[PDB]
Every structure is written in structure tokens, then in C-alpha cells.
């Protein structure tokens, strides 16, 4: 894990950090959720033409069986597993993860 876990940072800062125009699309980081306490979040930068650079945020909910998920069909025992999976194939994500955000 490590590289990509940014800790307790705000939605505002993650966007500030992901909207850097030299970041490739699919740059990401995992933070804590400001809105839902106990849940994390995956902030991916995307580039739609017309809207320009933007950031999609996905909430990673945890189950008491000890697994994380964004969707329920796919569950992971580990947030590092989740990152690995979404790096290999987007499978619903706006873009597969390609890059651990700089800092």
C-alpha cells in the first residue's frame, strides 16, 4: 500500500492535487471520507472534452465481514487489492487507475 494512501485529506485538497494538468488521466489517490465516517474514497482524475480535467470520487464502503467495495459485485479484502484490480481493468470505473498522484 503506502504510495497512494493520502490519509485524512479533504475532498477539496484531493481535487487541488489531482487537477494538475501534467497528471495523466487515471491518476488517483485513496483518502478518508469527509462525509461518511468509517468509509474511504478513491479520487480519480478524468478528462472529458467540454468539461475538461475533472475528478470522479468513489466511496469505498467496508463490510463487517472485513471487505471493501465500491460496487458489491466486486469485493476486495484489502484496499491494496482494490487498487491493483482497478489498475488492471477499469470495470465500471471512469478510467482504469494509471498513476499514483504526486506529492
Amino acid at each position: 500500500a503506502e504510495e497512494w494512501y493520502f490519509g485524512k485529506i479533504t475532498r477539496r485538497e484531493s481535487e487541488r492535487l489531482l487537477l494538475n494538468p501534467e497528471n495523466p488521466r487515471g491518476t488517483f489517490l485513496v483518502r478518508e471520507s469527509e462525509t461518511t465516517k468509517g468509509a474511504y474514497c478513491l479520487s480519480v482524475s478524468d478528462f472529458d472534452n467540454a468539461k475538461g480535467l475533472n475528478v470522479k470520487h468513489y466511496k469505498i464502503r467496508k463490510l463487517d465481514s472485513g471487505g471493501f467495495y465500491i460496487t458489491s459485485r466486486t469485493q476486495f479484502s484489502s484496499l491494496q487489492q482494490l487498487v491493483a484490480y482497478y489498475s488492471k481493468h477499469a470495470d465500471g470505473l471512469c478510467h482504469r487507475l494509471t498513476n499514483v498522484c504526486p506529492t
Binding site: 475532498r11 470520487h57 468513489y58 460496487t71
Partner: peptide, 7 residues
């Protein structure tokens, strides 16, 4: 705040 959901 809005969050994306996988469809």
C-alpha cells in the same frame, strides 16, 4: 457532495 457509482 456527489460521488460516482459504478452503474
Amino acid at each position: 457532495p456527489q460521488y460516482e457509482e459504478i452503474p
